[PDB]
Amino acid sequence: MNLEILDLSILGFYSLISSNSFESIAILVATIMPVITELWYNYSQLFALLYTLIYVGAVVILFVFILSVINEKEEYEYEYSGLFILILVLLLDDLDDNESNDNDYNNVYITDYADWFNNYNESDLSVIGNLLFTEYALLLLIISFILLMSIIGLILIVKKD
Amino acid sequence: MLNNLFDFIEYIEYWLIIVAFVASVLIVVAYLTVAERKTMGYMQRRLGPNAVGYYGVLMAVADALKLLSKEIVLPHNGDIIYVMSGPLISLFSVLLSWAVIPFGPGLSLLDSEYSIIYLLASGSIGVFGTVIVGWMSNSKYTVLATVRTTAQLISYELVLTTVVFIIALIVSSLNINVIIESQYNIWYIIPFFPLCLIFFISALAETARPPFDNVEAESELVSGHMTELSASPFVIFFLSEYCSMVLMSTLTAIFFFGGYLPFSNTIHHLILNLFDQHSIYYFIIEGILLSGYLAIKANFFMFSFVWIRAAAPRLRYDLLILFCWYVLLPIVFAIVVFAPGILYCFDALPVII
Amino acid sequence: SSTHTNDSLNSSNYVDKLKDTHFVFENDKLPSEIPDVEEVGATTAPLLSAAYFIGAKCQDYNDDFMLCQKEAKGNGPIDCLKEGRRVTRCASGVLKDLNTHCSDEFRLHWQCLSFSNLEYKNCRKAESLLNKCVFEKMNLVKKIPGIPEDRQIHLKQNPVLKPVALHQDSEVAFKKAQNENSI
Amino acid sequence: EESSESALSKATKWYLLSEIFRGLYITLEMYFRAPYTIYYPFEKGPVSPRFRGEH
Amino acid sequence: APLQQVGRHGGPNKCFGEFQRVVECMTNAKHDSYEPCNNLKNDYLECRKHKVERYKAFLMQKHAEELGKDPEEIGAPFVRKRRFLTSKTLGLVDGDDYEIGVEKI
Amino acid sequence: QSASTLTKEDVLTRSVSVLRGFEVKTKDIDLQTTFVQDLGMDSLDLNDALVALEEEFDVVFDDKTANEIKTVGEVVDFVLANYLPTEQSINHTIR
Amino acid sequence: MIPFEALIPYAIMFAGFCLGGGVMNSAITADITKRARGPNQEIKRNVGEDEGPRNYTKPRYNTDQWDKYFAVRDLRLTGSLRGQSDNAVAEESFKTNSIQPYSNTRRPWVLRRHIIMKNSPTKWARKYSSRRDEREQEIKDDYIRGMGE
Amino acid sequence: AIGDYPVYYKQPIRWLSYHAHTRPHVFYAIAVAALGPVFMMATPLRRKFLYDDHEPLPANGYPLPNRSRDKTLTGYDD
Amino acid sequence: MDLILLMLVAVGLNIIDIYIMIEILIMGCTVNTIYSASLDNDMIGLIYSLIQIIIAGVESAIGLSILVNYNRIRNSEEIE
Numbered sequence A: 001m002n003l004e005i006l007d008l009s010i011l012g013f014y015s016l017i018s019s020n021s022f023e024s025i026a027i028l029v030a031t032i033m034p035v036i037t038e039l040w041y042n043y044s045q046l047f048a049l050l051y052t053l054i055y056v057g058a059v060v061i062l063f064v065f066i067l068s069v070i071n072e073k074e075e076y077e078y079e080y081s082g083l084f085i086l087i088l089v090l091l092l093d094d095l096d097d098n099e100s101n102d103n104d105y106n107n108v109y110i111t112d113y114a115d116w117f118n119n120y121n122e123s124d125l126s127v128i129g130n131l132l133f134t135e136y137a138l139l140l141l142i143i144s145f146i147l148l149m150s151i152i153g154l155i156l157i158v159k160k161d
Numbered sequence B: 001m002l003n004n005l006f007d008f009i010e011y012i013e014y015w016l017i018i019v020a021f022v023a024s025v026l027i028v029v030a031y032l033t034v035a036e037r038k039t040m041g042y043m044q045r046r047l048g049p050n051a052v053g054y055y056g057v058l059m060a061v062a063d064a065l066k067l068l069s070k071e072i073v074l075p076h077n078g079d080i081i082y083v084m085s086g087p088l089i090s091l092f093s094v095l096l097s098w099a100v101i102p103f104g105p106g107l108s109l110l111d112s113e114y115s116i117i118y119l120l121a122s123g124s125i126g127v128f129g130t131v132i133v134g135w136m137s138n139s140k141y142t143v144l145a146t147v148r149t150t151a152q153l154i155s156y157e158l159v160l161t162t163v164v165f166i167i168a169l170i171v172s173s174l175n176i177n178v179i180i181e182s183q184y185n186i187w188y189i190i191p192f193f194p195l196c197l198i199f200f201i202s203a204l205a206e207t208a209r210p211p212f213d214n215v216e217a218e219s220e221l222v223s224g225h226m227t228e229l230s231a232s233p234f235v236i237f238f239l240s241e242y243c244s245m246v247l248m249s250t251l252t253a254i255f256f257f258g259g260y261l262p263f264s265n266t267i268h269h270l271i272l273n274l275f276d277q278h279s280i281y282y283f284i285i286e287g288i289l290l291s292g293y294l295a296i297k298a299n300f301f302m303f304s305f306v307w308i309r310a311a312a313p314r315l316r317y318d319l320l321i322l323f324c325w326y327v328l329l330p331i332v333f334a335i336v337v338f339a340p341g342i343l344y345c346f347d348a349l350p351v352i353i
Numbered sequence C: 001s002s003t004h005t006n007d008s009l010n011s012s013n014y015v016d017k018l019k020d021t022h023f024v025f026e027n028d029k030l031p032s033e034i035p036d037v038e039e040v041g042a043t044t045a046p047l048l049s050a051a052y053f054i055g056a057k058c059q060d061y062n063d064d065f066m067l068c069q070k071e072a073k074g075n076g077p078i079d080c081l082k083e084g085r086r087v088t089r090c091a092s093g094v095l096k097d098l099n100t101h102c103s104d105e106f107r108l109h110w111q112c113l114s115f116s117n118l119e120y121k122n123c124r125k126a127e128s129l130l131n132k133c134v135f136e137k138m139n140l141v142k143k144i145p146g147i148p149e150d151r152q153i154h155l156k157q158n159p160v161l162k163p164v165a166l167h168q169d170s171e172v173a174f175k176k177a178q179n180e181n182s183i
Numbered sequence D: 001e002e003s004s005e006s007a008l009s010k011a012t013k014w015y016l017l018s019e020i021f022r023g024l025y026i027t028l029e030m031y032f033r034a035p036y037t038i039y040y041p042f043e044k045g046p047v048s049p050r051f052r053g054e055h
Numbered sequence E: 001a002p003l004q005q006v007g008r009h010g011g012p013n014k015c016f017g018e019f020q021r022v023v024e025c026m027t028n029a030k031h032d033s034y035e036p037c038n039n040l041k042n043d044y045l046e047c048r049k050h051k052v053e054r055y056k057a058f059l060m061q062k063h064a065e066e067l068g069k070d071p072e073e074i075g076a077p078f079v080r081k082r083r084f085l086t087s088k089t090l091g092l093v094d095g096d097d098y099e100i101g102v103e104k105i
Numbered sequence F: 001q002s003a004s005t006l007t008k009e010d011v012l013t014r015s016v017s018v019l020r021g022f023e024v025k026t027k028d029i030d031l032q033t034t035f036v037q038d039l040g041m042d043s044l045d046l047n048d049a050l051v052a053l054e055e056e057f058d059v060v061f062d063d064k065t066a067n068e069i070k071t072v073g074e075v076v077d078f079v080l081a082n083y084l085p086t087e088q089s090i091n092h093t094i095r
Numbered sequence G: 001m002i003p004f005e006a007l008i009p010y011a012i013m014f015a016g017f018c019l020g021g022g023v024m025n026s027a028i029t030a031d032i033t034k035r036a037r038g039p040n041q042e043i044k045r046n047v048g049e050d051e052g053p054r055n056y057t058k059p060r061y062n063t064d065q066w067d068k069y070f071a072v073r074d075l076r077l078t079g080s081l082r083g084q085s086d087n088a089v090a091e092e093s094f095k096t097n098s099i100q101p102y103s104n105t106r107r108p109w110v111l112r113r114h115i116i117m118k119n120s121p122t123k124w125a126r127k128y129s130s131r132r133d134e135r136e137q138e139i140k141d142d143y144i145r146g147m148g149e
Numbered sequence H: 001a002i003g004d005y006p007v008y009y010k011q012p013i014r015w016l017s018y019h020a021h022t023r024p025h026v027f028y029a030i031a032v033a034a035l036g037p038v039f040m041m042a043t044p045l046r047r048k049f050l051y052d053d054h055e056p057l058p059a060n061g062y063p064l065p066n067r068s069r070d071k072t073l074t075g076y077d078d
Numbered sequence I: 001m002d003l004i005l006l007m008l009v010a011v012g013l014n015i016i017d018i019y020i021m022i023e024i025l026i027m028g029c030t031v032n033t034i035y036s037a038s039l040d041n042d043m044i045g046l047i048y049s050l051i052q053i054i055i056a057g058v059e060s061a062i063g064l065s066i067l068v069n070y071n072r073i074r075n076s077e078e079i080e
């Protein structure tokens, strides 16, 4: 039983019924956690950890803004929905989870063959840094330039002075 | 039975290893609460808890059992999601951070080339679980404490992350065990004495410990985010906060005092030469010895957590933000440029081996 | 490196569950037209212990097998089967000679590697005895290419990095040779 | 310009937390002194013949 | 010419050679049109997705069903649980069906 | 959005209904209808009506106007000239 | 005057670490050594009389891909991921006991099930538009048509 | 003019002192950071007076001999 | 269910809820990049994934500051 399917089923239910802004900042965290875990267990543990290191800091800053802008509006308001229309919507959605229509690509299993030629064996992050700091160093230096612009941009927007 | 009984232990052996791992960490956390009051008591010329259990050894048990026997305060029985989700996120975060702590060579539940990132990433989730208590709450002291938690997180997160990255840069690895074994000939306290202070200052701010206890400031916000918490939700938050103190004390011993490496190589060999290596008793003693070295260094920093609480007054958090952004960040980013330049000048760029 | 791939065992069985991994066997032997050869039966610790003696004995055959791979131009695994069989036999010859000439010295060294995370720096003493025994009986010298002979790390008198734990058998066997050979 | 200490002298006391470490040392001295606590009810604090208690 | 398809250890990966032979063909001055390099393009795309090879396996499985062939009699044996890659399955002389250790290497 | 949608006929109509729920001498209320004479309100009844007409239209009479008000038409004039919709949150308008 | 009562909780905390390390170092090392003795339970548990002293294998750390290939290769020779053998020649069963993992290559569940994360112009095209799969089916059909030549 | 603000291009030394007395968090962070590139500029001195750079690691795969295959190699045949 | 734009009901009714949708939508692109790069054993895709994460975090900050100042403008009297 792939229990990640159940997790996304609950998350989709709570995204349809979410009312206030605090629930939305919880839908975000309830989305990154399935992403981080599935990356950890299937494809990339490096990027599972990079997601946690960067998105959490963004989440708390996002949460602190909710405190300064919460404006009483959706606590006392009413929503109608209907339990039957919610579950029927989620049932129809769950029916079609085939993002791709290449049946052979989705059904036939493949393998790779290992070789011993790579005797200098290092992590993916060392190769990523090796290329990023040598061949795509321009991409890194532009990213540094964009980060500098954000620093100036945030000040010229928020600072009253 | 016999054969089925014997190989069922083999089927359950690693679970007991984890249970023993969990038990060992909880014993230190339980008796850190006792040790803090004993240490503060004698520094304050009192005794501290000595009436609950023989010489006070059951004080931690009494505090947990009494709090676990208290009514939980909440508007409704179905409102457990409100004041329990926060404590659990905080507790699960710090406990998962212990998976990468090696008590000896290879004696960590999780070993990977990105153990450093996992350590920083796991603890950042605990910060999120703390702010969840002020979830549109009508308690103004809980709300006021949530604002201060975010302000402290912004202060220490950059400095603590960058300091650990400099240590990882000196060894060119993000594996915690490799960083410990890289300190055979030198403990990083000597080359990076400024960074050890900054790491400990960041640890005090991360754990909301005095002089950075602006979150749970009793004289300001009665109990901070805990003012509405009673019984089990209060224990879990209290347990996780003292688990974080043990974790950051153990990380101070790992990043700067060689982790589990012996204080004296001569004495370490002398003690281990009494036991035959072909007997299982050698590896028990070695496990006790290596963890003892880690325990001694971590005990000193757990002592230092209590020591700074009993000597220094509290600093306002708006001053903490200026201190971290105007003083600590410029110094740490200077060393992140200083250190690679020194190593390149002497042709000593690190590699993993 | 602990990256999950599709060519070997992954970190845990949750990775297998997500990938629906099937660990597949093939009961067919190599075709009868291809000549047979006995595979090398040594595990990781003996092979690492014997790595520099296989290099000093099979250097011509190792290079010839690798040079065949370059000249194969993509048709590698097929066109170098004959060269590969020479490499396997030569490597087995070294392991055979170790177990008949330097058996105790050889088994001492790779039992230390198993005891010491398979790090060469942790087992210098047993390695020195094995190097001395192999050189006398097989005329094989460990050489690290690209550096002067007197800057080889395994011959360093006062290494900076040393094992925290001492292999008791290596300590005993090192003392015995000290008092009996270098009088 | 009218200070008595050099820039490095004031920065060494500042960066290395000179007075903070002194306060810790003073606190550590108390750790090795005799505490004041008496064990009530096995021991009683001093009383005087003028003491006012139960009638 | 920037590097593409770099393996996790810094060298060329499995499909770099296919890509390299495509670039050499397309940029060779002896070619009037790009028709000679069409088979090299399919080979590179087959190296990544194996779509035609998966399609062939689809035909073989389907063709075996219609002739009543047993999937377990014509396929390859497999084990789904890593703990049960036992010495008996591996064929060792003193093999056993007891589970293997995968908890800590 | 932030502008009035009031007409003189609606404000008069809502004013009459709110004044009908009180104990007035006559139910026939128009613009010229005075509070003291036609409806018969003393000092306290008049200010009960003014606050009742405040709640209906979400307006607040100033002290100077309230003390000097005589007729029903004066109230309708005041509501039309001073009514503003209440400001909404930053999300109600742009979303 | 060293207050011994204040130092008691530190002694228990010290013994807390030693409990974890003493158990983990010995229990794990013993299990690795036990499973390296042979391919069945009667050799792992029982100790032969003619056997020598027990040499222990310590837990491994700081591994890479080569150590994963080594671990599988050791399993095919000894039935253990850290088995021990210095025989110059393998058994006959080693020639045909290779393990090849075959796995699906599908996108993560969160990509194809999240209510918001699964919606994009190219994802809708891949899921609802047959333009892409019509072209790629022509390539597969050419493979069987061209067999005769 | 007892405590005026120095002009950097007129009194460089006094300008350095002002910031080292009033803004230590700026003066000394820069001073530490300057020691990075300065040591990198002293690297040529080390290559001539202390010791040379090490030989590069064999991290480019198996070292293939730069020659043709030996066509007279025999031994360990089928 | 996608073609009838069911995602328009899953997005909350605050401006910040639109910000979260944008982050989730971009995060879908990065997960697809990581998945393809890992299958191909290609580090260029992982370099792309790392760039997307850093850039997506930049616009999150720039958009937040605009929303922060927008709220300040409403609370402008500040007679205190």
Ligand SMILES: CCCCCCCCCCCCCCCCCC(=O)OC[C@H](COP(=O)(O)OCCN)OC(=O)CCCCCCCCCCCCCCCCC
Binding pocket: A007, A008, A010, A011, A014, A015, A018, A019, A022, A023, A024, A026, A027, A029, A030, A031, A033, B081, B082, B085, B086, B088, B089, B132, B135
């Ligand atoms: C250690 C476990 C921590 C979580 C345990 C509590 C379980 C509750 C749900 C957790 C997340 C599941 C998905 C929910 C996404 C957010 C939607 C939401 O609004 O929260 C649901 C919660 C229930 O409120 P309810 O009364 O049922 O609905 C409103 C009725 N007008 O309304 C609330 O506002 C309460 C939310 C409390 C704070 C939760 C913060 C999010 C924590 C997520 C961590 C785990 C990540 C998600 C894993 C599951 C994925 C489905």
Ligand SMILES: CCCCCCCCCCCC(=O)OC[C@H](COP(=O)(O)OCC[N+](C)(C)C)OC(=O)CCCCCCCCCCC
Binding pocket: B193, B194, B195, B197, B198, B200, B201, B211, B304, B308, B312, B315, B319, B323, B327, B331, D014, D015, D016, D017, D020, H028, H032
């Ligand atoms: C290059 C080498 C780096 C050295 C590494 C260490 C860096 C430390 C920087 C300290 C600067 C400072 O204390 O800053 C002071 C700031 C702000 O003070 P201010 O408002 O500017 O007033 C002071 C300026 N005067 C004097 C020039 C006018 O806040 C504080 O009081 C911070 C107090 C931190 C105490 C934490 C306790 C830690 C205990 C550790 C036990 C193991």
Ligand SMILES: CCCCCCCCCCCC(=O)OC[C@H](COP(=O)(O)OCC[N+](C)(C)C)OC(=O)CCCCCCCCCCC
Binding pocket: D012, D013, D014, D016, D017, D018, D019, D021, D022, D024, D025
């Ligand atoms: C070894 C590693 C641990 C300690 C590391 C840091 C220690 C302080 C360094 C800065 C000192 C400084 O800046 O010195 C400045 C001052 C004194 O100078 P002054 O005011 O001009 O003196 C006036 C003129 N005299 C020189 C004639 C006296 O010294 C101190 O207050 C030293 C206090 C140290 C006592 C406590 C030691 C134990 C501390 C706790 C350790 C866990």
